[PDB]
Design a protein around this ligand. Structure first.
Ligand SMILES: O=C1CO[C@H](CO)[C@@H](O)[C@@H]1O
Ligand SMILES: O=C1CO[C@H](CO)[C@@H](O)[C@@H]1O
Ligand SMILES: O=C1CO[C@H](CO)[C@@H](O)[C@@H]1O
Ligand SMILES: O=C1CO[C@H](CO)[C@@H](O)[C@@H]1O
Ligand SMILES: [Mg+2]
Ligand SMILES: [Mg+2]
Ligand SMILES: [Zn+2]
Ligand SMILES: [Zn+2]
Lengths: 880, 880
């Protein structure tokens, strides 16, 4: 399933900065690289030195309460430009390498400038690290650290853009610096010039480790006027591989070739593609591709350049808006997207301000599409997981601001935090916007409420994702998809709602669980010691606490969730006076996509001993409701429903003996209580409300003291199809099959007319001409929380589905536009004593059972009919 | 109807400031006071002077494209503290009055300091205004400008907090300064000391104009150690009126009394209440009240102090978190809420960080409740309409940050913009979160899309609100509530959906329209010249443009809305190939409240000549859909629906003669097309989908060139009850009535048992004992877009409603918890040739017509029955 972009909670790392040029992700220790810091700064001015401020990552430490990024001044430098880092001292701390003394601009280059230097990490978070000089070369513009001719030392490649003021035509030395055995002695680093290039504006590095053995040394990618270029060493010699020339020169315009270039991973190949921005500070985005079946990596292939976008014209000084391109697996599917850092433009224009995120949509043809991620100036981009231990990629940017050239307003640093859940305050209640679990490749955990001895945590899971829980203590309640675990009694599974009137324990009994093909969205009930211990004798004992992560907006963090006694709620209207009966609100969960559709509404309730939460039937508003009890004060509290008809039951003086009880014990959820058609569509009232019998929560009877409160969580789902009444036997495993009709000799198979993907393509029985048309393949699968199945074309995906309306003799077709709740594309299965299978639609109350059937005994068309048992028997051969 | 709080779009006015203390709303001109600027600053330090930066309001000019607040340095001052403004030069520009030279703290008071000075407004937006000295007094802490002993000159009241370092016990002069005839000559201002007070920490002013003639001069309110105090002049003498003492002193604690105080308007009274914060920088909120029926204003009443909140303990230097209280009609109901500026606390704590907004909930008892508006440090608050011409009140804050005392992170200025609509990007589509029109007191306009020669503008209206439109050009489509206009043919009205299969012009033919009792939420189609002119020959001609206001978030502002050809849409699946048939998405409108409920989903469509948007029936997803056509390319395009049953119609090769057509001309909307029960509940399919016959948009037939596109807007509503089939006659005006049964002598009336507000109170016929029980009153009103009515108790509000379920002989009760779509609380009316009225429920298909009826011929109970015509006749007398 194509990977979806994740969501992005923005957060302001540093604001109102004087200026801004550079931002980098800085892992303090060089061993590990999760939750790094950010280092950022600007080019400074003649009046004021630039503070290279290292901002501390607050999420760097778990148990985090801060969102604030603490600024540590690493140093104070005359026009710094570029930087990188590596463990120079070989002590497991990262040391900063930085160039400075550039000049104020390319027409103000410092003759004795372009200094390259390293800042020694002292192992703690004091400011002002001892600085040392690596070396000088006028115009010094970019550098990277790695192992280029030797592995047993830190080496630095450094490259001036020009050598002197306004001189755009003299090329610069590509320089390599080498650590001594003892970098702590103030002395000059060994240097080599390894080529001369014109107007190099970016250096990119491909570590030896990423090349899956191809290269023992680090590869240098240079984006310049000469274009995009690859230099590498092999042990004996330097060689060069031209990737391309980039922008063709125009007359009068000193800039051509490239300003930035990055190497994209695709699958097993670390160089699936090289992306590029042209020229120096240009407006042109392009990508170099190589022919299908090329060798892995850069140098063994010939590269061709295709232009993707030109974001509009250049100004009189022949510049534009693109400062950088970088590569990163944003959506976490194993292919690298690339991000374009937009400086902003003049006049102002959002098309040219922010980050564009390009996604490789078609691997064969190398087609891309761009989405907008952020629309506030990006002078530089840095990527890294900035908030968790998993492999999400967050995006940090610094605003591009240089006085006397181009200034954006409120020059700042913000980071955009990858997440599959977002939290927004409405008023008293909260909005949890969620990704479709189906198409994320990321696990997301967000704690929200600490109540009744439990930490309520909203959790999204990618397909086939594992959640490591606490055996027998942890509990779950699935809201979308399915989860699964196994102990001594085999496999167990949890779906949005169990069997009508059933009861299921929420306690995971294994050390971990796993999500279904469709992933899962769930509430994990974690054990908490900060919210009391049952039994609960008072509401003061059940105070709940606001648990949202430091990185959620403040208005959400500042919210309290009091328990309000139902009698006092605005919707009470004189009702529930004198009842220890309380209610806590509340948490909307809705999909973050363009449907904005509801997943569930959640709120909470408590009942003292002898208390009835009142009988009702939900005529006021439409929902399929499932309760999960957390604490059962008496061991005997649960749900009652009336067995007599609605007319026959007085809700006010309720006769409990026209009622049946389901104890919902500690950490259990119960099955649906609403009325349902035989195959599990709900009954509907005249005002479009899920039809329910009279029902209520009743707490255990007896002495109100000592007190002992029931605590339960309401789950208000929109309509769906549940299980069948009565439950069919299980006569079919899902799997890929051929679906066939007939006997020993004369047989035919179910088929999608000319294998055609279009909605409304006919479905047929194709005679098995022993000439060799070959029987088509069908994927059959169970629908979770039902007793129904669907049949989907192995090849197109098309669902076997009766055309509208499902009556005696309707034609059958393939569709990707099924009706709500699978009304015409889900089937009840039987199996005769022969072994034949039958497929039936949700029975409507007028038309009888209608089966998937042939119509005779060239292609026979397919229909649903009720009349003949013979036409509807099918033999299932396993296919592939 | 109680007024709801409006919504707040936050916006960052200035960030990453060094420090922060003061913020003020500064009207550049002194004539007008809409869209003022903001002036703000901090106390500065010994190293750096404080820039009193005046930030330009970008919304100050209409046709605004900027959100950025341009900083103008007004001056650069040694420890400024407080400020105000007034037109000193009498030239219609506001001049700034400011104190500075305070000292660094109360233990570092400047002996020759406390300077008071004015900055001359030069009539333009250059920086650095000529400064002049008004006068000095050590410790100078607060001041206000007004007319206190004379009207023909600007006067300034100024008050030191202390007179010298750490001296907390010597009180200070309350000083009055007077402009000369010629303030432009550098000379000293005339001064008077008008009293001495202890630790005055706030000055508040009550202009002569607000006192409705009571006071010819301005009233001075002082919050200090002596408490909250009122000094005023009358022409001859000063007098003083003690409002209260405030915090009672504790031993060892130099602070008591008050730190801030503000005067709240209530209705016709400008001093309904005085609110207060205690003590100096304290944690205590209280309010002074006066006895019901007191005279208006402050000095003619005796004031009593009630404590509302104590936000937690004090630190060792006996301080807390509250810096200021102010008053403002936030919700616009004619009563002033008050806001508390929270500095933040230590350790950090949101309860003490931000603004609390208190609302006077009960005028009689003077009860308040607080809501949280913002949760980022507020050192000072300023209120003013910062973005429109109406009377919404926005909230600006500056962070409280003083180094070496208390520092919050990212000291900045933000403003919170009052609005009833909020705009949030989802992905390709937009979320428009809206207030309930019913309970706002503000008109809100937000343009979103410029398309087909129209500016599509979302509009919320308070009840009985007027929208001034362009006669015959402007158009409207109501999504909630009702609008109304009148021309020569009388009154016209527009509701969410007109009569099934009808057609209504959207063109307002008057110069204005007005909203209904329930207000309205609508799309106003404004005339645009930036989006082309019909007829539309190409899609390039119908490019639409993103119109959201500069104050909406950036991601929303940066969005494009392309027209995508339906064939290429993801949901297309081989369908609509080769059809000039396009689609633009999209705009969710949802209520901003805790229900988060849908109002409508909106998207757009176009069809070339001879094009059918395809036949369908909405089995895929549930909605009540209404289309509004903007441009009809042929004059003949519209909606077709099948008249044969669903089985009888082949959607693929559609036989147009089993179809009927409704031309939806230019600027018209049509009536519902879905199937409906006789009183207008929709028919529902087995999968809970609004049941529709086969239907489609078909463009006019004939020559595809010249081209000519239909352009229409889809409105996807959730289920509701529409009009009745067939339409009943109008036999009843709404109004207040007594509802009576019988004949000449023996009569009884409909009544709510013991006038009791509780849900499920019985409804009865009370014998009219001529002793004098007196007949109860009932409000009867039409339900918009239906042909039904409801009966609501004049006194409680309780709806006359049959208990569940509505069958032969059901009991009738009063409720505020009605069922969805009024299923049991809405009535079809008849009137016999006598004049008697009958009330019938939405007829269910089993039980017959059930009428509101008595049950005999002490109180007779009330029921719904079908059997007897006699028991159900009612006589309606007008009541009051
Ligand atoms: O579109 C949908 C399909 O399945 C989900 C649950 O698993 C629904 O809640 C959602 O609205
Ligand atoms: O079933 C339920 C739904 O709403 C009821 C309100 O009285 C609750 O008591 C209970 O959670
Ligand atoms: O609660 C509601 C009542 O009326 C509105 C329209 O006027 C609805 O759309 C809304 O969902
Ligand atoms: O009635 C409608 C709803 O969806 C259809 C999609 O083909 C549109 O053509 C038309 O706006
Ligand atoms: Mg090191
Ligand atoms: Mg003036
Ligand atoms: Zn990816
Ligand atoms: Zn108000």
């Amino acid at each position: 399933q194509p990977a979806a972009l994740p969501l992005f909670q923005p957060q302001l790392v540093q604001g109102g900065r004087p200026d801004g040029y550079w931002v980098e992700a800085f892992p303090f220790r060089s061993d590990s690289s999760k939750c790094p810091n950010i280092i950022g700064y600007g080019l400074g001015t003649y009046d004021m030195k630039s503070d290279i401020q290292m901002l501390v990552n607050p999420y760097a430490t778990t148990n985090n309460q801060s969102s604030s990024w603490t600024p540590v001044p690493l140093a104070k430098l005359d026009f710094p430009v570029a930087m990188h880092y590596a463990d120079i001292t070989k002590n497991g701390f990262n040391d900063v390498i930085i160039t400075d003394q550039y000049g104020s601009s390319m027409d103000d280059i410092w003759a004795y400038g372009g200094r390259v230097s390293w800042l020694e990490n002292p192992g703690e978070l004091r400011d002002n690290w001892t600085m040392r000089t690596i070396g000088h070369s006028p115009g010094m513009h970019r550098l990277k650290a790695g192992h280029f001719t030797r592995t047993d030392r830190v080496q630095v490649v450094a490259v001036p853009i020009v050598v002197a003021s306004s001189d755009l035509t003299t090329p610069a030395d590509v320089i390599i610096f080498t650590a001594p055995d003892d970098p702590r002695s103030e002395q000059l680093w060994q240097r080599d010039v390894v080529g001369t290039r014109h107007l190099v504006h970016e250096v990119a590095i491909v570590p030896a480790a990423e090349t899956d053995g191809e290269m023992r040394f680090d590869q240098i990618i240079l984006a310049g006027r000469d274009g995009v270029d690859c230099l590498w060493y092999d042990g004996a010699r330097w060689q060069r591989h031209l990737v391309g020339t980039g922008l063709p020169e125009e007359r009068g315009d000193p800039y051509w070739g490239a300003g930035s270039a990055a190497v994209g991973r695709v699958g097993d190949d670390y160089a699936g593609y090289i992306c590029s921005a042209e020229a120096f500070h240009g407006n042109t985005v392009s990508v170099y591709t190589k022919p299908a079946g090329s060798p892995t990596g850069i140098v063994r292939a010939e590269w061709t350049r295709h232009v993707l976008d030109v974001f509009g014209p250049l100004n009189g000084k022949h510049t534009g808006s693109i400062h950088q391109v970088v590569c990163a697996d944003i959506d976490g599917d194993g292919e690298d997207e690339f991000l374009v850092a937009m400086m902003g433009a003049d006049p102002p224009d959002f098309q040219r301000t922010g980050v564009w995120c390009y996604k490789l949509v078609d691997r064969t043809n190398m087609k891309f599409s761009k989405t907008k991620v952020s629309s506030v100036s990006a002078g530089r981009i840095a990527t890294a997981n900035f908030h968790s231990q998993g492999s999400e990629v967050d995006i940090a940017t610094i605003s591009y601001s240089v006085p006397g050239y181009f200034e954006s307003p409120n020059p700042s640093i913000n980071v955009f935090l990858s997440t599959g859940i977002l939290a927004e305050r409405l008023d008293e209640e909260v909005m949890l916007r969620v990704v479709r679990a189906g198409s994320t490749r990321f696990k997301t955990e967000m704690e929200f409420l600490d109540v009744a001895g439990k930490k309520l945590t909203l959790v999204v899971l990618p397909p086939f994702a594992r959640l490591d829980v606490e055996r027998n203590v942890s509990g779950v309640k699935v809201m979308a998809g399915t989860v699964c675990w196994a102990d001594e009694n085999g496999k167990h599974e949890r779906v949005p709602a169990t069997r009508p009137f059933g009861c299921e324990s929420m306690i995971v009994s294994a050390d971990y669980l796993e999500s279904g093909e469709e992933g899962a969205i769930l509430v994990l009930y974690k054990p908490s010691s900060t919210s009391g211990r049952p039994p609960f004798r008072s509401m003061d004992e059940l105070v709940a606490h606001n648990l949202f992560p430091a990185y959620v907006p403040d208005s959400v963090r500042a919210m309290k969730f009091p328990w309000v006694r139902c009698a006092d709620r605005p919707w009470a209207h004189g009702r529930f006076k004198d009842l220890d009966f309380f209610n806590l609100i509340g948490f909307h969960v809705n999909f973050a996509d363009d449907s904005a559709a509801v997943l569930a509404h959640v709120q909470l309730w408590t009942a003292g001993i002898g208390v009835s939460a009142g009988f009702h039937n939900h005529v006021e508003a439409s929902f399929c409701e499932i309760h999960a009890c957390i604490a059962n004060g008496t061991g005997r509290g649960g749900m009652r429903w009336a067995t007599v008809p609605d007319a026959n039951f007085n809700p006010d003086s309720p006769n409990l003996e026209d009622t049946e009880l389901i104890v919902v014990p500690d950490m259990h959820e119960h099955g649906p209580l609403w009325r349902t058609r035989p195959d599990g569509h709900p009954l509907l009232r005249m005002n479009d409300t899920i039809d329910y019998p009279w029902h209520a929560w009743l707490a255990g009877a007896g002495n109100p003291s000592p007190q002992a409160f029931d605590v339960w969580v309401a789950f208000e789902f929109p309509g769906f199809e549940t299980f069948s009444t009565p439950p069919p036997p299980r006569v079919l495993e899902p799997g890929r099959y051929a679906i066939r009709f007939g006997d020993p000799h004369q047989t035919a198979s179910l088929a999608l007319q000319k294998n055609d993907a279009t909605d409304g393509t006919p479905v047929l029985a194709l005679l098995d001409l022993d000439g060799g048309p070959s029987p088509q393949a069908w994927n059959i699968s169970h629908v979770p929380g039902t007793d129904m199945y669907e049949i989907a074309h192995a090849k197109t995906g098309s669902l076997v589905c009766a055309r509208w309306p499902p009556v005696k003799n309707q034609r059958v077709a393939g569709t990707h536009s099924p009706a709500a709740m699978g009304l015409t594309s889900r089937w009840a299965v039987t199996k005769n004593t022969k072994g034949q299978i039958t497929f039936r639609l949700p029975e409507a109350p007028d038309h009888g059972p209608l089966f998937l059937s042939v119509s005779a005994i060239d292609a026979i068309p397919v229909i649903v009919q009720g009349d003949s048992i013979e036409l509807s028997a099918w033999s299932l051969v396993p296919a592939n």
